[PDB]
Design a protein around this ligand. Structure first.
Ligand SMILES: CCCCCCCCCCCCO[C@@H]1O[C@H](CO)[C@@H](O[C@H]2O[C@H](CO)[C@@H](O)[C@H](O)[C@H]2O)[C@H](O)[C@H]1O
Ligand SMILES: CCCCCCCCCCCCO[C@@H]1O[C@H](CO)[C@@H](O[C@H]2O[C@H](CO)[C@@H](O)[C@H](O)[C@H]2O)[C@H](O)[C@H]1O
Lengths: 240, 48, 176
């Protein structure tokens, strides 16, 4: 029961937070709509396939659902970051969506395929540990596939219709957010610009001293191995 | 031939496809039961 | 032996043919997307970096690598995978548009900077509710949450910094 409520609580949380984030970056009521639709119909849609493969709701499968809502959001954000960045570079919202999906569409099916390549084989592990991994893996993988289908069909279209050209006019909604929450808009948009600029400076210098980057990655992966084998192993943790 | 047109201009894709097929077969072989003949012996029940 | 001890004593370790089969499988898919046998290593080679980072959270706490934090680790390194894949494909496509390799990687990082940070800050804002609250199963939710924090930090930092370095390094030894 608790797990069930978790999977719903987080979901609403995952909605709320994500919409906040988009209005902070793609500052319009237009865009905020579409992950609010995207991330529920994905996770809920998961259940359907979860039924067809004979699974059940349980602590572990619902845990996997709670983990998967995150990649679902991530797909929604990338889609509409790209579409509103198109609008920013000065394209009509429909042509904006066209260029955006030409840019990331085949990618998205590729990443769904590699995510399946890493997640589906987890369902064929051995030992009751493996039977727990199986619930986790199947739930996450089918959520990935459904979220990819959503990110390729509904989110870009809804961006095309919902969003209008930039500037246009801060409409009734947009004027409300503009006046009410312009409190803290500008300082950190411009701080974001400065932090961006610092970021390409840092990479431009690190791309010169690539040998040192290799030298730290080396022995950082050695620390990763020693830590993989000093942090306690993996079995079911006892609970109250 | 547009199928083949796509593939000849992307040879690494073609290699990847053939390798995927080969890999799935290679992991399938140890999983398969080794018998003589397919299962044709008809099952029987004894009553004593 | 009896019970789960007996099951351990008789079970095999299929992970030794599940982890590699996964890895190269992903590699194969990436090889098809990039049309390169080497460009996939820009993504793959950065994912063990986030693992340690996520794992470091447990070392921060002193917990264990139970099955829940294991699946959380795999999930966050999948997120790192997707970030690296998108920036690497953006850099390669920029190169196909006539730009040099280093400016292409630079500008690809530039374009993709915003989505990565907004996704990550959304998560790390959702992480604070995952160290307190109300409900049962507290051990599970915690041991996931602290890692999720440290691992998302690692995901962003090491994607946005290693993947451009890895991309330019890998692409310098194939153009002759
Ligand atoms: C692109 C999308 C990716 C989809 C590809 C999915 C790939 C799946 C392959 C996973 C790796 C293969 O891993 C394989 O797991 C099976 C489980 O049946 C193990 O098999 C083990 O359990 C089975 C089932 O009880 C027994 O019959 C067998 O004798 C035993 O070895 C194999 O020893 C191992 O070779
Ligand atoms: C005993 C074998 C059993 C397993 C069989 C599995 C099938 C094997 C097929 C894969 C064959 C090798 O795959 C092949 O590799 C070459 C060499 O890197 C790639 O070629 C690549 O590098 C060459 C340089 O030599 C470039 O000129 C070319 O543009 C580029 O695509 C081909 O695009 C790919 O098709």
């Amino acid at each position: 029961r608790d797990s069930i409520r978790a999977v719903v609580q987080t979901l609403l949380e995952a909605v709320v937070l994500v919409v906040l984030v988009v209005i902070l970056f793609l500052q319009t009521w237009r865009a905020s709509i579409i992950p609010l639709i995207a991330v529920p119909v994905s996770v809920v849609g998961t259940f359907s396939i979860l039924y067809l493969l004979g699974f059940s709701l349980n602590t572990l499968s619902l845990f996997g659902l709670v983990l998967a809502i995150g990649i679902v959001v991530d797909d929604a954000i990338v889609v509409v970051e790209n579409v509103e960045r198109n609008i920013e570079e000065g394209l009509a919202p429909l042509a904006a969506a066209h260029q955006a999906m030409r840019e990331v569409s085949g990618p998205i099916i590729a990443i769904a395929l590699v995510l399946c390549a890493v997640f589906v084989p987890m369902a064929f592990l051995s030992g009751v540990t493996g039977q727990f991994y199986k619930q986790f893996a199947v739930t996450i993988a089918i959520s990935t596939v459904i979220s990819a289908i959503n990110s390729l069909t509904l989110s870009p279209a809804l961006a095309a219709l919902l969003l209008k050209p930039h500037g246009a006019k801060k409409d009734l909604p947009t004027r409300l957010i503009d006046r009410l929450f312009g409190w803290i808009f500008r300082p950190f948009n411009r701080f974001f610009l400065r932090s961006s600029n610092g970021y390409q400076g840092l990479v431009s210098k690190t791309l010169g001293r690539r040998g040192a980057v290799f030298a730290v990655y080396l022995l950082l992966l050695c620390a990763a191995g020693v830590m993989f084998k000093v942090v306690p192993g993996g079995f079911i943790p006892t609970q109250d | 031939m547009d199928f083949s047109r796509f593939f000849i201009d992307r040879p690494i894709f073609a290699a990847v496809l053939s390798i995927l097929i080969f890999i799935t077969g290679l992991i399938a072989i140890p999983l398969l039961p080794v018998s003589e003949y397919p299962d044709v012996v008809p099952p029987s029940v004894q009553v004593r | 032996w009896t019970d789960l001890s007996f099951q351990q004593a008789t079970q095999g370790n299929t992970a030794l043919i599940v982890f590699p089969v996964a890895v190269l499988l992903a590699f194969l898919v990436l090889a098809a997307l990039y049309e390169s046998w080497t460009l996939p290593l820009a993504v793959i080679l950065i994912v063990p970096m986030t693992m340690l980072s996520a794992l470091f959270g447990v070392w921060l706490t002193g917990g264990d690598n139970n099955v829940f934090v294991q699946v959380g680790l795999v999930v966050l390194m999948g997120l790192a995978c997707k970030n690296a894949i998108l920036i690497v494909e953006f850099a390669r496509e920029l190169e196909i548009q006539g730009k040099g390799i280093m400016e292409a990687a630079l500008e690809a990082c530039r374009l993709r900077l915003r989505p990565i940070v907004m996704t990550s800050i959304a998560f790390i804002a959702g992480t604070i509710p995952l160290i307190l609250g109300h409900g049962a199963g507290a051990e599970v939710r915690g041991v996931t949450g602290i890692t999720v924090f440290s691992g998302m930090l690692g995901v962003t930092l090491f994607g946005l910094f290693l993947t451009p370095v890895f991309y330019v390094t890998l692409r310098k030894l194939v153009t002759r």
